[PDB]
Structure 1
Amino acid sequence: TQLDIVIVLDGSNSIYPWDSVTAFLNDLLKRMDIGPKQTQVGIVQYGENVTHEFNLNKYSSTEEVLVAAKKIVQRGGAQTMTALGTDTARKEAFTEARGARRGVKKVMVIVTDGESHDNHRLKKVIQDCEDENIQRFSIAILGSYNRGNLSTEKFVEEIKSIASEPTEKHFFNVSDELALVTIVKTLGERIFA
């Protein structure tokens, strides 16, 4: 079965350098066969609000997706609304109106480097994602936290709660931005296999 993939990117300013995120997107995407009858990719960026960078059916080829992924700019933000960004991907990104197809497996990839301001909604948002059979891969970047000498225990536990089970398979603990690209092959093959 094919796959509708929606990448949800935290765009907060603490994430640096943005080139690491786009390099991560490029590497993950270039090894996919994007098409209306193949894999479809949609990308959403969130900070304090949410923005659909491009819908699931916006681009019909891998080359096109790559071009669009490289153009994504960091929108910034002072408070991380992960619940909002995730719920929106479920509510809007994954809709026929934006390209989502029938009889296709839905996959969400969440990338963030901080604890969410609306973490009180995560329980509900996630459960709704589960009821809709959306497989979730969450990635926590401990870069800004470590550099700020902040405790990452709760943060890791929170992003982990977003991941689908097993968990050790859907959750990725990334030490820093430059290390993002090192999970591409594993994540890549897991999204599919």
Structure 2
Amino acid sequence: QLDIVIVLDGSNSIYPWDSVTAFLNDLLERMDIGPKQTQVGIVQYGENVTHEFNLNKYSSTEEVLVAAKKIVQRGGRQTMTALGIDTARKEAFTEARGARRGVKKVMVIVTDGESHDNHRLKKVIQDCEDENIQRFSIAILGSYNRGNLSTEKFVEEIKSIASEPTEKHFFNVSDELALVTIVKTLGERIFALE
């Protein structure tokens, strides 16, 4: 029994967006979704934050898959990852939006750049840790590599978001088309680690 919130960077450097919705489809279709099973909410951030749907909006896997396919890329000049994570913690994981007392809490964060608000990450991550939110973080290195930008500081930032052990919770994904390849391992760990 898990409440899972997926936190999606919507910035326009991620391309094609079909790669992200394919990742969502493949990950979510392997779950048993319902008010007494797994619940999924999805938040998208860029420059601001939007709840695509709350944890208790949908009570079946079929419904979640239909909604996930329709999620549009929202774009954004800036990448406010700390705001996205903090909003997932303070808003998505609330009883008002369907969060359940006593279930396992998992956040999955998908991003392709360093965050403009990275000075907030230390506090935001510690607040998630205090609230028992297990964090899987996914760095997509595609746009950085395509722009010949160094990725080492980026990888370090996204690793810092992942729960320990870091190597089980952090995924380095070379490019958008490779995102779907992590689904089997990610799903296994979501339901195996605490």
Return the TM-score normalized by structure 1.
0.99
Please state whether the residue corresponding to 2:75 is helix, strand or coil.
Answer: coil
1:161-189 alpha-carbon deviations (Å, 9 max, x no partner): 00000010000000000000000000000
TM-superposed deviation, 1:144:
0.2
Task: Provide the rounded CA distance (Å) in 2 between the counterparts of 1:100 and 1:58.
Answer: 11
What is the number of residues matched between the two proteins? Answer: 192
Task: Provide the rounded CA distance (Å) in 2 between the counterparts of 1:55 and 1:151.
Answer: 36
1:53-73 alpha-carbon deviations (Å, 9 max, x no partner): 000000000000000000000
Unaligned runs of 5+ in 1: none
Task: Provide the rounded CA distance (Å) in 1 between the counterparts of 2:156 and 2:110.
Answer: 14
1:25-79 alpha-carbon deviations (Å, 9 max, x no partner): 0000001000000000000000000000000000000000000000000000011
* Runs of 4+ more than 4 Å apart: none
Task: Provide the rounded CA distance (Å) in 1 between the counterparts of 2:146 and 2:102.
Answer: 44
Task: Provide the rounded CA distance (Å) in 1 between the counterparts of 2:93 and 2:102.
Answer: 13
1:143-166 alpha-carbon deviations (Å, 9 max, x no partner): 000000000010000000000000
TM-superposed deviation, 1:89:
0.1
Task: Provide the rounded CA distance (Å) in 2 between the counterparts of 1:150 and 1:3.
Answer: 37
Task: Provide the rounded CA distance (Å) in 2 between the counterparts of 1:155 and 1:94.
Answer: 27
Please state whether the residue corresponding to 2:168 is helix, strand or coil.
Answer: coil
Root-mean-square deviation (CA, aligned residues, Å) is 0.3
Task: Provide the rounded CA distance (Å) in 2 between the counterparts of 1:37 and 1:112.
Answer: 30
Question: How does 1:1-193 map onto structure 2 within 5 Å?
Answer: 2-193=1-192
Please state whether the residue corresponding to 1:120 is helix, strand or coil.
Answer: helix
TM-superposed deviation, 1:134:
0.3
Unaligned runs of 5+ in 2: none
TM-superposed deviation, 1:103:
1.1
Return the TM-score normalized by structure 2.
0.99
1:97-139 alpha-carbon deviations (Å, 9 max, x no partner): 0000011010000000000000000000000000000000000
Task: Provide the rounded CA distance (Å) in 1 between the counterparts of 2:34 and 2:102.
Answer: 15
